[PDB]
């Protein structure tokens, strides 16, 4: 794992010692190179995970997440360098440094062998994200958003810290392999109930679970474009990865401790999808869509079947790509017209045709058109839920309809009709923006050909 990690660290002084006009070029080139090297973790043994050393290991659950992180960094650099043009050299280097530190923390968190190291890195991701949001955020509301993002997260994660140190005192280890091989059932007692809650609530608030989701519209809407990209594509998946890891010590209690979280996630799926139908802000709509998708992932993890875990992995990856693409698409128009309101600019297909094609493809993967991997994940989760109880189809069926509705609503409102007469500063699409969209989209389509790579450990 050292081969991936050291170069990422190297990226730091490479950008601090670069000429003022070459920072973006250098960072993008070597980020792409790092992504290529990482691509080699997808070779998986089968029966067990690849254990590089005592400290790091890679899984089939882990490999897809790492490749997505490393691939997301150059895209964030492409998306950032436009609105950061007026910035001083030192502040541009500081912004790139924040992004690099975030990538470094993320890679380590996914591959840490034991929970305490996972916890420390999973929490260290908070600092660069908060700095990005509050320092480079466009609006006044960013300060409030930063506080919401911090406090919601820490209120969940500190009980997890207490629970983890208690578990290592009683078991003797927090190493994930030892944790798995020496697993013993959790009795049904008040102590075990609160241990379960303390082990679960941090990852629940990271997802986010419905009702503990209020930080996400704030933080995802008030952040700069790269902040939003990394918040939706990767940082939401920390909760899913951590839950998939931690639920091995929680059996057989999960059988009934999962009921309220399943109820919240299914009904709130319906709720956030309906909310997307009456939204005046375009980033707000994409944020709530992310919430709806992660509710599906929460259900999949709580019901604890091989098909549900496979579907959850596929949906996490597909959501990460699609949501980042949608945020970038919204940001291009925002850059044009300097407002987030969805009905301000209309009929953009008449003015920007290729960007309208990108819009259509992103909207089609958001509603999970077959045979995209979005539908693969959603279908696997829906089947597992059907096995869990046949009545889930009603909720699942309803959600599919509302998602199609708001996806095509967004597409029709922004691209179709007639253009607003007054706005006359809509310039042709830049090569940078088109290439950013293609680099989001091509990987998703390519993934359909080889579905097993994003499927996970259960496969």
């Amino acid at each position: 794992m050292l081969k991936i990690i050291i170069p990422t660290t190297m990226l730091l002084p490479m950008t601090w010692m670069s000429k003022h006009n070459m920072i973006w070029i250098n960072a993008t080139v070597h980020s792409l190179l790092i992504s290529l090297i990482s691509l080699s973790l997808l070779n998986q043994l089968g029966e067990n995970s690849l254990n590089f050393s005592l400290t790091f290991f890679s899984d089939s659950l882990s490999a897809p997440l790492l490749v997505l992180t490393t691939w997301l960094l150059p895209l964030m650099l492409m998306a950032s360098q436009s609105h950061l043009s007026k910035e001083t050299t030192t502040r541009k280097k500081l912004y790139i440094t924040m992004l690099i530190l975030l990538q470094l923390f993320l890679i380590m968190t996914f591959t840490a062998t034991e929970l305490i190291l996972f916890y420390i890195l999973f929490e260290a991701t908070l600092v660069p994200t908060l700095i990005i949001i509050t320092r480079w955020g466009n609006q006044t509301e960013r300060l409030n958003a930063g506080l919401y993002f911090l406090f919601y997260t820490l209120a969940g994660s500190l009980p997890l810290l207490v629970a983890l140190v208690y578990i290592q005192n009683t078991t003797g280890s927090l190493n994930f392999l030892i944790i798995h091989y020496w697993s013993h059932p959790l009795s049904n007692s008040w102590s075990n109930i609160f241990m379960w809650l303390a082990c679960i609530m941090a990852f629940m608030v990271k997802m986010p679970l419905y009702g503990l989701h209020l930080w996400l519209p704030k933080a995802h809407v008030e952040a700069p474009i790269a902040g939003s990209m990394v918040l939706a594509a990767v940082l939401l998946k920390l909760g899913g990865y951590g839950m998939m890891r931690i639920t091995t010590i929680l059996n057989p209690l999960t059988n009934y401790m999962a009921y309220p979280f399943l109820m919240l996630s299914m009904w709130g799926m319906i709720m956030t999808s309906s909310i997307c139908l009456r939204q005046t802000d375009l980033k707000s709509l994409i944020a709530y869509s992310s919430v709806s998708h992660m509710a599906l992932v929460i259900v999949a993890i709580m019901i604890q079947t091989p098909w549900s875990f496979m579907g959850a992995t596929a949906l996490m990856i597909a959501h990460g790509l699609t949501s980042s693409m949608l945020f970038c698409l919204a940001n291009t128009n925002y850059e044009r017209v300097h407002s987030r309101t969805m009905i301000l600019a209309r009929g953009l297909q008449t003015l920007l045709p290729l960007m309208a094609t990108w819009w259509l493809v992103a909207s089609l993967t958001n509603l999970a058109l077959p045979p995209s991997i979005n539908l693969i994940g959603e279908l696997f989760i829906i089947t597992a839920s059907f096995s869990w109880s046949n009545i889930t189809i009603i909720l699942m069926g309803m959600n599919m309809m509302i998602t199609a509705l708001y996806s095509l609503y967004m597409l029709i409102t922004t691209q179709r009709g007639k253009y607003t007469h007054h706005i006359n500063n809509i310039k042709p699409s830049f090569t940078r923006e088109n290439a950013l969209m293609a680099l989001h989209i091509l990987p998703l389509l390519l993934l359909t050909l080889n579905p097993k790579m994003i499927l996970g450990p259960l496969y």
């Binding site: 006009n21 070459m22 973006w24 070029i25 993008t28 080139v29 792409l32 190179l33 992504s35 290529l36 691509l39 080699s40 997808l42 070779n43 998986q44 043994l45 089968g46 029966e47 691939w71 150059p74 492409m78 360098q81 436009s82 043009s85 310039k427 042709p428 830049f430 090569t431 940078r432 923006e433 290439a435 293609a438 680099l439 091509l442 990987p443 390519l446 050909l449 080889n450 097993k452 790579m453």
Partner: protein, 104 residues
């Protein structure tokens, strides 16, 4: 002053197309802009996408699915060649298990 402060006026954003009609949207400097375009396109579409997809497509069978298929073929041949059951409801040998002796 009936003012609150000495502040710069909010400037209009500059169109990269005005000084560079073919400007690729990467940078104000046309040379740096062209080379940013070139490095992005080469290292993203040529190196990572094509060569990486090829590498992933030709990854060796470490997941052992071909091996598993051949093993199942051996087992099925041997088991219905001998009249034995294709599969046994017991995964482990009942002679290696020592149940608790009395059940009431």
């Amino acid at each position: 002053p009936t003012i609150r402060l000495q502040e710069d006026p909010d400037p209009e954003d500059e169109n990269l197309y005005e000084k560079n009609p073919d400007s690729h949207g990467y940078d104000k400097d046309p040379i740096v802009d062209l080379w940013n375009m070139r490095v992005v396109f080469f290292f993203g579409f040529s190196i990572v996408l094509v060569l990486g997809s090829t590498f992933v497509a030709y990854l060796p069978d470490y997941r052992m699915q071909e091996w598993a298929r051949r093993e199942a073929e051996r087992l099925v041949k041997y088991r219905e060649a001998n009249g034995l059951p294709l599969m046994e409801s017991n995964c482990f040998d009942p002679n290696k298990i020592q149940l608790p002796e009395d059940e009431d």
